[PDB]
Subunit: 207 residues, 2 copies
């Protein structure tokens, strides 16, 4: 069998990516080698031919690559009811955010900072746990350990059930995603592309 | 707040680890920095003081560390019914395993190889997808993409419902786990230890 090297961000792997990839592998003989990038190396990997294709938040064409917008991955800033009670008893304020334990994926994760900037109109430096795991983020949020930005696909049911609540309802953070494919592999991998684009169309918000 | 550097394998992070850690953080002021090790660097990290404590399959004391056995993480070799139908129509045989797509976490993941060795009494080289994700492994198994070893905690309900089946019923793979703590931090972190050991007692199989 031929093995295809493909990159994805963790949050897509934790949601929709395998749903797309499995549709493709189910109808072909290809194997996949899935590289998970959350240190922003995808552009270098594409340039160096270390992967042939990638789901990335990077819009800008790696020179040569074919680029297709996939839609928007929406995140909500969420915590448990007990977390809110203990840390935001008199609201989500800059003072409170300076003391409440956040969740941060790694040193390149700007989502909580961005959400604060947008929600409160200023930057607040927040104390944080460090948790480089999409599924771990959700578990930590549910367990009352911290607040953080989680993809809507992983928290919609929890929100509906009241197991999580939004720090500030109606303040989502949207990250557009792109599918980048090495131009020399693109025709060969048209089936994979069709499955990525088609699956993202159903799951992500439209561009 | 003081931040505690703690290491875990991915499979514990995907199951019980945060349940233990959150009990500890809920009652104290500590923050945690969770390093996920699946390249077998935990021993070096402990030696270098880069983490203070770790859940690890390594039994052997890093010189100095206090070591407590936690119990056994049991895995089952699982695939979907359609996977079994397509790839193991006339049984799980060496010939079939040489052709069926496996799932392998990374180049250090010996679990599928070990399971084969044990189940069939010989080594078989299997084609594989590469998928360095605990939650991804389960999703790929459910999606009919490959077979692989998954922790029982993540597949028990799927097995009961028939969404997954065991390649060979009654052939689990057991990995004992250990909690290693820097001796100089151990008393200070006794509460964390109590929560790790107590949680593992409920979730893992007894030693
Ligand atoms: Ca996140
Ligand atoms: Ca596994």
């Amino acid at each position: 069998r031929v093995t295809l090297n493909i990159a994805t961000n963790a949050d897509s792997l934790g949601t929709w990516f395998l749903d797309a990839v499995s549709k493709f592998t189910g109808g072909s003989d290809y194997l996949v080698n899935i590289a998970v990038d959350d240190q922003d190396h995808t552009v270098e990997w594409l340039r160096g031919g270390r992967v042939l294709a990638a789901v990335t938040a990077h819009d800008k064409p790696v020179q040569g690559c074919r680029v297709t917008p996939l839609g928007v991955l929406r995140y909500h800033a969420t915590a448990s009811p007990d977390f809110m009670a203990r840390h935001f008893a008199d609201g989500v304020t800059p003072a409170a955010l300076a003391r409440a334990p956040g969740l941060t994926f790694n040193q390149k994760d700007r989502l909580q900072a961005s959400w604060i900037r947008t929600a409160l109109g200023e930057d607040v430096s927040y104390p944080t746990h460090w948790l480089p795991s999409t599924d771990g983020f959700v578990k930590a949020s549910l367990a009352g350990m911290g607040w953080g930005l989680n993809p809507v696909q992983l928290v919609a049911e929890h929100l509906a059930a009241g197991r999580l609540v939004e720090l500030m309802p109606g303040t989502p953070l949207d990250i557009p995603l792109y599918w980048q494919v090495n131009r020399l592999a693109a025709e060969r991998l048209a089936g994979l592309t069709a499955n990525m684009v088609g699956t993202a169309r159903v799951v992500l918000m439209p561009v």
